[PDB]
Amino acid sequence: GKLKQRSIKAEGDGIVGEGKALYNNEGGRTFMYAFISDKPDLRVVKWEANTIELEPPRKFLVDSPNGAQIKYLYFVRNLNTLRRGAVLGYIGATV
Amino acid sequence: PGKLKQRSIKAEGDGVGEGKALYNNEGGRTFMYAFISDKPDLRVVKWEFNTIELEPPRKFLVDSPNGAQIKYLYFVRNLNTLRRGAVLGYIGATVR
Numbered sequence: 001g002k003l004k005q006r007s008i009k010a011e012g013d014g015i016v017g018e019g020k021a022l023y024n025n026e027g028g029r030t031f032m033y034a035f036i037s038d039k040p041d042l043r044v045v046k047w048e049a050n051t052i053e054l055e056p057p058r059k060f061l062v063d064s065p066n067g068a069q070i071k072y073l074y075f076v077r078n079l080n081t082l083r084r085g086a087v088l089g090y091i092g093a094t095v
Numbered sequence: 096p097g098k099l100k101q102r103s104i105k106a107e108g109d110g111v112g113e114g115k116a117l118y119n120n121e122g123g124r125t126f127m128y129a130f131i132s133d134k135p136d137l138r139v140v141k142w143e144f145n146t147i148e149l150e151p152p153r154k155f156l157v158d159s160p161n162g163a164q165i166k167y168l169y170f171v172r173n174l175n176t177l178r179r180g181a182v183l184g185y186i187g188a189t190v191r
Contacts, residue, residue: 001183001184001187002187002191003184003187003188058096060096060097081176081177081180082176082177082179082180082183083180084177084180085176085177085178085179085180085181085182085183085184086180086181086183086184086187087180087184088096088097088180088181088184089099089180089181089182089183089184089185089186089187089188090184090185090187090188091097092096092097092098092099092181092185093099093184093185093188093189094188095097095098
């Protein structure tokens with residue numbers, strides 16, 4: 001199950017944050033699994049004219065030249081278990 | 096979190112096989128999740144420390160520098176759906 005990405009703008013409350021969404025283009029149709037962002041407090045992503053709420057950020061640290069960095073993983077509302085492991089499978093390969 | 100690993104090993108069947116094994120490590124404790132081989136239809140992966148039994152292989156293709164390619168995927172017996180997803184999400188990135 002290959003996993004793709006699409007940079008997108010999310011929203012918190014007064015927080016408005018851009019970031020990278022993880023999706024899945026099975027045949028013609030799309031499906032967003034998770035959203036990786038650097039600002040917490042984020043509430044909703046707007047995906048397609050359709051809104052998507054997010055979840056309690058799980059926290060972790062990803063490296064780089066400019067330094068390993070705090071990061072915030074958001075699973076979309078009620079993502080089935082199998083796809084959650086699938087998300088963590090992708091990240092913990094590209095780290 | 097986080098962190099999934101790889102280590103080549105030999106697996107047996109009622110009959111032998113060899114291939115990739117996706118595994119994990121925590122506070123020193125070494126966990127095995129899945130085994131990948133081009134050969135059906137093995138039973139066990141022996142890990143020198145247990146007789147770890149394998150599920151019937153799920154089957155998949157990957158594109159290569161020499162065309163199309165068969166490999167089988169064996170989850171371990173009764174592996175929790177969560178950890179099943181990472182195996183699949185990992186491979187997904189890992190190969191094509």
